Amino acid sequence: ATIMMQRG
Amino acid sequence: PQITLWKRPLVTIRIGGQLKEALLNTGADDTVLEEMNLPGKWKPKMIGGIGGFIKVRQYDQIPVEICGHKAIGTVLVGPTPVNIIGRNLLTQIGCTLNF
Amino acid sequence: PQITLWKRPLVTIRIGGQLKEALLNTGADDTVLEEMNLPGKWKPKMIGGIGGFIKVRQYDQIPVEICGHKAIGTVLVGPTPVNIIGRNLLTQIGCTLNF
C-alpha cells in the first residue's frame, strides 16, 4: 500500500 | 460539499472523542494517522512513498467521522508528518474527483 | 469526468509527445514524474513525503495534457515511485473533490 503524500 | 484545491484539502475528523485535522488524499491507498493510542489488536506494517518506507501499526474496524460523515475501516498509525485520509475511507463517504 | 476512488485514480497524460500513466493526487502540492528528459533549464530541488526527502529536477512552464485538458506549469522530475499530478496542475484543469 502506497501513500503518495507530497510536500513542496 | 465541494472542496477546491487552491490549498491543501485539510478537514476535521473525529476519532474516539479526539478531534484532528486530516488531509484528504486521493494519492494514498490507506489512512495514516499520527501517533495515538487506539484500543484493540494491531499488526505491524511497512508503508511506502516518496523518500522510502516507515513502520506503522494497523488497527481494523476503527470508527472515524469525516465532516459529519460516518466511516469505519482500517487505520494505520505511525510517524507521519501529517494525518492522511486515504481511499479506503474516502470511498465510504462517496468522495469523487471531478473536472 | 467524475472519478470514483475504489481503484487508484490513474489517468493518461501527454507530455512532449510521450504518453504516461499518472495518479491524480490531492495529497501532493506539486507534480512529480519519474526520471525522463525534458527541454529547458532545470534547477535542483528537494521535496519530502512519507519516507523522507528526495532530490528532484524542476522544470518550469511545461505543457501537460491531462485526459484532454491542457495545463502549463511546473513539473518536478526524480525518483518518485509513481507519476503523480499534484494540486499545481489539478487546479488548472478545474478539478475538485466532492462528497
Side-chain angles (χ1 to χ4, degrees), chain B residues 24-34 36-40 42 44-76:
Chain B
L24 261 34
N25 192 171
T26 59
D29 303 317
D30 306 297
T31 294
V32 190
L33 305 168
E34 191 174 354
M36 79 177 286
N37 293 74
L38 291 178
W42 51 263
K45 199 175 186 181
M46 292 287 277
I47 61 175
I50 289 300
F53 290 71
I54 62 169
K55 184 181 175 189
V56 302
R57 291 184 296 164
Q58 183 186 315
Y59 296 80
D60 308 292
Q61 304 300 313
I62 299 303
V64 181
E65 194 175 70
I66 306 165
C67 284
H69 288 255
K70 290 182 181 178
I72 183 177
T74 302
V75 167
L76 308 182

Short mmCIF file of all heavy atoms in Angstrom, two decimals, chain B residues 24-76, unseen atoms left out:
data_model
loop_
_atom_site.label_atom_id
_atom_site.label_comp_id
_atom_site.label_asym_id
_atom_site.label_seq_id
_atom_site.Cartn_x
_atom_site.Cartn_y
_atom_site.Cartn_z
N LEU B 24 -7.22 15.12 2.93
CA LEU B 24 -7.99 14.27 2.03
C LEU B 24 -7.00 13.92 0.93
O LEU B 24 -6.65 14.77 0.10
CB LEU B 24 -9.19 15.04 1.47
CG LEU B 24 -10.53 14.80 2.17
CD1 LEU B 24 -10.34 14.54 3.66
CD2 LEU B 24 -11.44 15.99 1.92
N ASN B 25 -6.55 12.67 0.91
CA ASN B 25 -5.51 12.25 -0.03
C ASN B 25 -5.88 11.13 -1.00
O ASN B 25 -5.84 9.96 -0.65
CB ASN B 25 -4.27 11.87 0.81
CG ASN B 25 -3.02 11.69 -0.02
OD1 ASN B 25 -1.92 11.54 0.52
ND2 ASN B 25 -3.17 11.71 -1.33
N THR B 26 -6.20 11.50 -2.24
CA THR B 26 -6.55 10.52 -3.25
C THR B 26 -5.31 9.73 -3.68
O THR B 26 -5.41 8.68 -4.31
CB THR B 26 -7.17 11.19 -4.50
OG1 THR B 26 -6.25 12.13 -5.06
CG2 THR B 26 -8.47 11.91 -4.13
N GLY B 27 -4.14 10.25 -3.33
CA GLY B 27 -2.89 9.58 -3.67
C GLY B 27 -2.43 8.57 -2.63
O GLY B 27 -1.31 8.06 -2.71
N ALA B 28 -3.29 8.28 -1.65
CA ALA B 28 -2.97 7.31 -0.60
C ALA B 28 -3.99 6.18 -0.61
O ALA B 28 -5.20 6.43 -0.62
CB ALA B 28 -2.97 8.00 0.76
N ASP B 29 -3.51 4.94 -0.60
CA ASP B 29 -4.40 3.77 -0.59
C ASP B 29 -5.05 3.62 0.78
O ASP B 29 -6.22 3.26 0.89
CB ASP B 29 -3.63 2.47 -0.88
CG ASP B 29 -2.88 2.50 -2.19
OD1 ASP B 29 -3.44 2.98 -3.19
OD2 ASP B 29 -1.73 2.02 -2.21
N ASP B 30 -4.27 3.89 1.82
CA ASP B 30 -4.74 3.75 3.20
C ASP B 30 -4.78 5.06 3.96
O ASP B 30 -4.33 6.10 3.47
CB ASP B 30 -3.83 2.79 3.95
CG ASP B 30 -3.69 1.45 3.26
OD1 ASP B 30 -4.71 0.75 3.11
OD2 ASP B 30 -2.56 1.12 2.86
N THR B 31 -5.30 4.98 5.17
CA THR B 31 -5.42 6.12 6.06
C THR B 31 -4.31 5.97 7.10
O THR B 31 -4.16 4.92 7.72
CB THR B 31 -6.78 6.13 6.77
OG1 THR B 31 -7.82 6.35 5.80
CG2 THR B 31 -6.84 7.21 7.82
N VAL B 32 -3.53 7.03 7.26
CA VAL B 32 -2.42 7.02 8.20
C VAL B 32 -2.53 8.21 9.13
O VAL B 32 -2.42 9.36 8.70
CB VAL B 32 -1.07 7.12 7.46
CG1 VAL B 32 0.08 6.84 8.44
CG2 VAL B 32 -1.05 6.13 6.30
N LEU B 33 -2.74 7.94 10.41
CA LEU B 33 -2.85 9.00 11.40
C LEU B 33 -1.57 9.04 12.22
O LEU B 33 -0.87 8.04 12.36
CB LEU B 33 -4.05 8.73 12.29
CG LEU B 33 -5.34 8.56 11.49
CD1 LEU B 33 -6.44 8.01 12.38
CD2 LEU B 33 -5.75 9.89 10.87
N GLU B 34 -1.26 10.21 12.76
CA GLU B 34 -0.05 10.33 13.56
C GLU B 34 -0.19 9.50 14.83
O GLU B 34 -1.27 8.98 15.13
CB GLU B 34 0.23 11.79 13.92
CG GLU B 34 1.62 11.98 14.51
CD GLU B 34 1.99 13.43 14.75
OE1 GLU B 34 1.22 14.33 14.35
OE2 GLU B 34 3.07 13.66 15.33
N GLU B 35 0.91 9.37 15.56
CA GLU B 35 0.93 8.59 16.78
C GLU B 35 -0.24 8.90 17.71
O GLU B 35 -0.53 10.06 18.01
CB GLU B 35 2.25 8.80 17.51
N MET B 36 -0.91 7.84 18.15
CA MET B 36 -2.04 7.94 19.07
C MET B 36 -2.39 6.54 19.51
O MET B 36 -2.21 5.57 18.76
CB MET B 36 -3.25 8.59 18.39
CG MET B 36 -4.04 7.66 17.50
SD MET B 36 -5.49 8.49 16.83
CE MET B 36 -6.55 8.54 18.26
N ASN B 37 -2.89 6.41 20.73
CA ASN B 37 -3.24 5.10 21.23
C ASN B 37 -4.66 4.73 20.88
O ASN B 37 -5.59 5.51 21.07
CB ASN B 37 -3.03 5.02 22.75
CG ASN B 37 -1.57 5.11 23.13
OD1 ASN B 37 -0.96 6.18 23.07
ND2 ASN B 37 -0.99 3.98 23.52
N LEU B 38 -4.81 3.53 20.34
CA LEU B 38 -6.12 3.02 19.97
C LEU B 38 -6.24 1.67 20.64
O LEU B 38 -5.26 0.95 20.80
CB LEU B 38 -6.24 2.88 18.45
CG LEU B 38 -6.29 4.16 17.62
CD1 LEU B 38 -6.36 3.80 16.14
CD2 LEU B 38 -7.49 5.00 18.02
N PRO B 39 -7.46 1.31 21.05
CA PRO B 39 -7.66 0.02 21.70
C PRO B 39 -7.71 -1.07 20.64
O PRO B 39 -7.90 -0.79 19.46
CB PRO B 39 -8.99 0.20 22.40
CG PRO B 39 -9.74 1.04 21.41
CD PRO B 39 -8.71 2.08 21.01
N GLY B 40 -7.52 -2.32 21.06
CA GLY B 40 -7.58 -3.42 20.12
C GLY B 40 -6.23 -3.92 19.66
O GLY B 40 -5.19 -3.30 19.93
N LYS B 41 -6.25 -5.06 18.98
CA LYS B 41 -5.03 -5.67 18.47
C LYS B 41 -4.61 -4.92 17.21
O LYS B 41 -5.41 -4.22 16.59
CB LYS B 41 -5.28 -7.14 18.15
N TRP B 42 -3.34 -5.05 16.85
CA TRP B 42 -2.80 -4.40 15.67
C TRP B 42 -1.65 -5.20 15.08
O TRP B 42 -0.88 -5.82 15.82
CB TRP B 42 -2.30 -3.00 16.03
CG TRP B 42 -1.38 -2.98 17.21
CD1 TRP B 42 -1.70 -2.71 18.51
CD2 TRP B 42 0.03 -3.23 17.20
NE1 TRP B 42 -0.59 -2.77 19.30
CE2 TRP B 42 0.49 -3.09 18.53
CE3 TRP B 42 0.95 -3.56 16.19
CZ2 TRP B 42 1.84 -3.27 18.87
CZ3 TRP B 42 2.29 -3.74 16.54
CH2 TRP B 42 2.72 -3.59 17.87
N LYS B 43 -1.54 -5.19 13.75
CA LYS B 43 -0.48 -5.91 13.07
C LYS B 43 0.57 -4.90 12.57
O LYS B 43 0.22 -3.81 12.11
CB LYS B 43 -1.05 -6.71 11.89
N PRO B 44 1.86 -5.25 12.66
CA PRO B 44 2.95 -4.37 12.22
C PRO B 44 2.93 -4.30 10.69
O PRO B 44 2.64 -5.30 10.02
CB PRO B 44 4.21 -5.08 12.73
CG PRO B 44 3.70 -5.92 13.88
CD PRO B 44 2.40 -6.45 13.33
N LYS B 45 3.25 -3.14 10.14
CA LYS B 45 3.23 -2.99 8.70
C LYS B 45 4.20 -1.93 8.21
O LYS B 45 4.54 -0.99 8.93
CB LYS B 45 1.81 -2.63 8.26
CG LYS B 45 1.51 -2.87 6.80
CD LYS B 45 0.05 -2.60 6.51
CE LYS B 45 -0.30 -2.97 5.07
NZ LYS B 45 -1.72 -2.66 4.76
N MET B 46 4.66 -2.11 6.97
CA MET B 46 5.59 -1.18 6.34
C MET B 46 4.86 -0.50 5.19
O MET B 46 4.35 -1.19 4.30
CB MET B 46 6.80 -1.94 5.80
CG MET B 46 7.70 -2.55 6.86
SD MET B 46 8.65 -1.28 7.70
CE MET B 46 10.02 -1.07 6.54
N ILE B 47 4.80 0.82 5.19
CA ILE B 47 4.14 1.53 4.09
C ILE B 47 5.16 2.44 3.42
O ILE B 47 6.07 2.96 4.07
CB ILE B 47 2.94 2.38 4.57
CG1 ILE B 47 3.40 3.43 5.57
CG2 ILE B 47 1.90 1.47 5.20
CD1 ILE B 47 2.31 4.38 5.99
N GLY B 48 5.00 2.63 2.11
CA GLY B 48 5.95 3.45 1.39
C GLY B 48 5.42 4.61 0.60
O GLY B 48 4.22 4.76 0.39
N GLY B 49 6.35 5.44 0.15
CA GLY B 49 6.00 6.61 -0.63
C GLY B 49 7.27 7.29 -1.08
O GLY B 49 8.32 6.65 -1.19
N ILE B 50 7.18 8.59 -1.29
CA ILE B 50 8.33 9.39 -1.68
C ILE B 50 9.30 9.35 -0.50
O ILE B 50 8.91 9.54 0.65
CB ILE B 50 7.92 10.85 -1.96
CG1 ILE B 50 7.11 10.92 -3.26
CG2 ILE B 50 9.14 11.75 -2.03
CD1 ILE B 50 7.86 10.42 -4.46
N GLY B 51 10.56 9.08 -0.80
CA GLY B 51 11.57 9.01 0.24
C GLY B 51 11.83 7.60 0.74
O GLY B 51 12.96 7.26 1.05
N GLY B 52 10.79 6.76 0.80
CA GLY B 52 11.00 5.41 1.29
C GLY B 52 9.85 4.84 2.10
O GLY B 52 8.68 5.12 1.82
N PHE B 53 10.18 4.03 3.11
CA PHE B 53 9.18 3.38 3.96
C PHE B 53 9.26 3.74 5.44
O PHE B 53 10.30 4.14 5.94
CB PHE B 53 9.30 1.86 3.87
CG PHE B 53 8.86 1.28 2.56
CD1 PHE B 53 9.62 1.46 1.41
CD2 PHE B 53 7.68 0.56 2.47
CE1 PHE B 53 9.21 0.92 0.19
CE2 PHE B 53 7.26 0.01 1.25
CZ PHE B 53 8.03 0.21 0.11
N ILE B 54 8.13 3.58 6.13
CA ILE B 54 8.07 3.79 7.57
C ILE B 54 7.24 2.64 8.12
O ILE B 54 6.39 2.09 7.42
CB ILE B 54 7.38 5.12 7.99
CG1 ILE B 54 5.93 5.13 7.52
CG2 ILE B 54 8.17 6.30 7.46
CD1 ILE B 54 5.12 6.27 8.12
N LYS B 55 7.50 2.29 9.36
CA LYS B 55 6.78 1.21 10.02
C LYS B 55 5.58 1.81 10.75
O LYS B 55 5.71 2.81 11.46
CB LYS B 55 7.72 0.52 11.00
CG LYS B 55 7.14 -0.70 11.70
CD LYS B 55 8.19 -1.25 12.65
CE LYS B 55 7.66 -2.39 13.49
NZ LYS B 55 8.64 -2.76 14.54
N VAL B 56 4.42 1.20 10.57
CA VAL B 56 3.22 1.68 11.22
C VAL B 56 2.47 0.54 11.90
O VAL B 56 2.83 -0.64 11.75
CB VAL B 56 2.26 2.35 10.21
CG1 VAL B 56 2.96 3.50 9.51
CG2 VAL B 56 1.79 1.32 9.19
N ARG B 57 1.44 0.89 12.67
CA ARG B 57 0.61 -0.09 13.35
C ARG B 57 -0.76 -0.09 12.68
O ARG B 57 -1.36 0.96 12.48
CB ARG B 57 0.45 0.27 14.83
CG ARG B 57 1.71 0.13 15.67
CD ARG B 57 1.42 0.41 17.14
NE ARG B 57 1.01 1.79 17.35
CZ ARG B 57 0.42 2.24 18.45
NH1 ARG B 57 0.16 1.41 19.46
NH2 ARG B 57 0.08 3.52 18.55
N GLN B 58 -1.24 -1.28 12.32
CA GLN B 58 -2.53 -1.39 11.66
C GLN B 58 -3.67 -1.80 12.59
O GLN B 58 -3.63 -2.88 13.18
CB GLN B 58 -2.45 -2.40 10.52
CG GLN B 58 -3.74 -2.52 9.74
CD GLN B 58 -3.70 -3.61 8.71
OE1 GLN B 58 -2.72 -3.76 7.98
NE2 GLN B 58 -4.77 -4.39 8.63
N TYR B 59 -4.67 -0.94 12.70
CA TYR B 59 -5.84 -1.23 13.52
C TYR B 59 -7.03 -1.37 12.58
O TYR B 59 -7.16 -0.61 11.62
CB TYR B 59 -6.13 -0.09 14.51
CG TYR B 59 -5.05 0.13 15.54
CD1 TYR B 59 -3.89 0.84 15.23
CD2 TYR B 59 -5.20 -0.36 16.84
CE1 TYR B 59 -2.90 1.05 16.19
CE2 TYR B 59 -4.21 -0.16 17.81
CZ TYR B 59 -3.07 0.55 17.48
OH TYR B 59 -2.10 0.76 18.43
N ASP B 60 -7.89 -2.34 12.85
CA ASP B 60 -9.04 -2.57 11.99
C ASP B 60 -10.36 -2.14 12.64
O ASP B 60 -10.45 -2.00 13.86
CB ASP B 60 -9.12 -4.05 11.62
CG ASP B 60 -7.81 -4.57 11.06
OD1 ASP B 60 -7.42 -4.16 9.94
OD2 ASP B 60 -7.16 -5.39 11.75
N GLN B 61 -11.37 -1.93 11.80
CA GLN B 61 -12.70 -1.56 12.24
C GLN B 61 -12.76 -0.35 13.16
O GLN B 61 -13.52 -0.34 14.12
CB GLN B 61 -13.37 -2.74 12.95
CG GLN B 61 -13.44 -4.02 12.13
CD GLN B 61 -14.24 -3.86 10.85
OE1 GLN B 61 -15.33 -3.29 10.85
NE2 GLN B 61 -13.69 -4.36 9.75
N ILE B 62 -11.96 0.68 12.87
CA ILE B 62 -11.95 1.88 13.69
C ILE B 62 -12.99 2.87 13.16
O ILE B 62 -13.01 3.18 11.97
CB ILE B 62 -10.55 2.55 13.68
CG1 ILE B 62 -9.51 1.59 14.26
CG2 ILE B 62 -10.58 3.86 14.45
CD1 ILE B 62 -9.80 1.10 15.68
N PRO B 63 -13.89 3.36 14.04
CA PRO B 63 -14.91 4.32 13.61
C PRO B 63 -14.30 5.71 13.48
O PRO B 63 -13.62 6.18 14.39
CB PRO B 63 -15.94 4.26 14.74
CG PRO B 63 -15.72 2.90 15.36
CD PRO B 63 -14.22 2.80 15.36
N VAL B 64 -14.54 6.35 12.35
CA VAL B 64 -13.99 7.68 12.11
C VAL B 64 -15.06 8.56 11.48
O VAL B 64 -15.80 8.12 10.61
CB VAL B 64 -12.77 7.63 11.14
CG1 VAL B 64 -12.20 9.02 10.93
CG2 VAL B 64 -11.70 6.70 11.71
N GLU B 65 -15.18 9.80 11.95
CA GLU B 65 -16.16 10.70 11.36
C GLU B 65 -15.44 11.80 10.59
O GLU B 65 -14.60 12.52 11.13
CB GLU B 65 -17.07 11.32 12.42
CG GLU B 65 -18.29 11.99 11.78
CD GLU B 65 -19.28 12.52 12.80
OE1 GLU B 65 -18.96 13.51 13.48
OE2 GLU B 65 -20.38 11.93 12.90
N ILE B 66 -15.78 11.91 9.31
CA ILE B 66 -15.18 12.90 8.42
C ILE B 66 -16.24 13.90 7.97
O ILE B 66 -17.18 13.54 7.25
CB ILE B 66 -14.59 12.21 7.17
CG1 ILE B 66 -13.63 11.10 7.60
CG2 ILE B 66 -13.89 13.23 6.29
CD1 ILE B 66 -13.27 10.14 6.50
N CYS B 67 -16.08 15.15 8.39
CA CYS B 67 -17.02 16.21 8.04
C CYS B 67 -18.47 15.78 8.20
O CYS B 67 -19.26 15.89 7.27
CB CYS B 67 -16.79 16.68 6.60
SG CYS B 67 -15.34 17.72 6.39
N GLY B 68 -18.81 15.28 9.39
CA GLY B 68 -20.17 14.85 9.65
C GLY B 68 -20.56 13.53 9.00
O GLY B 68 -21.73 13.14 9.03
N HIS B 69 -19.59 12.84 8.41
CA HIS B 69 -19.86 11.56 7.76
C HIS B 69 -19.24 10.42 8.55
O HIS B 69 -18.09 10.50 9.00
CB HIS B 69 -19.30 11.56 6.35
CG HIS B 69 -20.08 12.41 5.39
ND1 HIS B 69 -20.92 11.88 4.44
CD2 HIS B 69 -20.16 13.76 5.26
CE1 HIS B 69 -21.48 12.87 3.76
NE2 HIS B 69 -21.03 14.01 4.24
N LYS B 70 -20.01 9.35 8.73
CA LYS B 70 -19.54 8.19 9.47
C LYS B 70 -18.82 7.20 8.56
O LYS B 70 -19.29 6.87 7.48
CB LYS B 70 -20.71 7.48 10.16
CG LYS B 70 -21.32 8.25 11.32
CD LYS B 70 -22.44 7.46 11.98
CE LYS B 70 -23.06 8.24 13.13
NZ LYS B 70 -24.18 7.50 13.75
N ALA B 71 -17.66 6.75 9.03
CA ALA B 71 -16.86 5.79 8.28
C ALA B 71 -16.15 4.86 9.25
O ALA B 71 -15.74 5.27 10.33
CB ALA B 71 -15.84 6.53 7.42
N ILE B 72 -16.02 3.60 8.85
CA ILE B 72 -15.34 2.62 9.69
C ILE B 72 -14.45 1.75 8.82
O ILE B 72 -14.90 1.16 7.84
CB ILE B 72 -16.36 1.73 10.44
CG1 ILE B 72 -15.61 0.76 11.36
CG2 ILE B 72 -17.23 0.96 9.46
CD1 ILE B 72 -16.52 -0.11 12.20
N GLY B 73 -13.18 1.67 9.17
CA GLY B 73 -12.26 0.86 8.40
C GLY B 73 -10.89 0.76 9.03
O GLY B 73 -10.69 1.05 10.21
N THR B 74 -9.93 0.34 8.21
CA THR B 74 -8.58 0.18 8.69
C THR B 74 -7.89 1.53 8.84
O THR B 74 -8.05 2.44 8.02
CB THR B 74 -7.76 -0.70 7.73
OG1 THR B 74 -8.41 -1.98 7.62
CG2 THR B 74 -6.34 -0.89 8.25
N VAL B 75 -7.13 1.66 9.92
CA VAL B 75 -6.39 2.87 10.20
C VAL B 75 -4.96 2.50 10.56
O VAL B 75 -4.73 1.63 11.41
CB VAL B 75 -7.02 3.63 11.38
CG1 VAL B 75 -6.07 4.70 11.87
CG2 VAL B 75 -8.35 4.24 10.95
N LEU B 76 -4.00 3.14 9.90
CA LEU B 76 -2.60 2.89 10.19
C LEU B 76 -2.10 4.04 11.06
O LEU B 76 -2.42 5.20 10.81
CB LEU B 76 -1.78 2.81 8.90
CG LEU B 76 -2.29 1.85 7.82
CD1 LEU B 76 -1.33 1.87 6.64
CD2 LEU B 76 -2.42 0.43 8.38
#
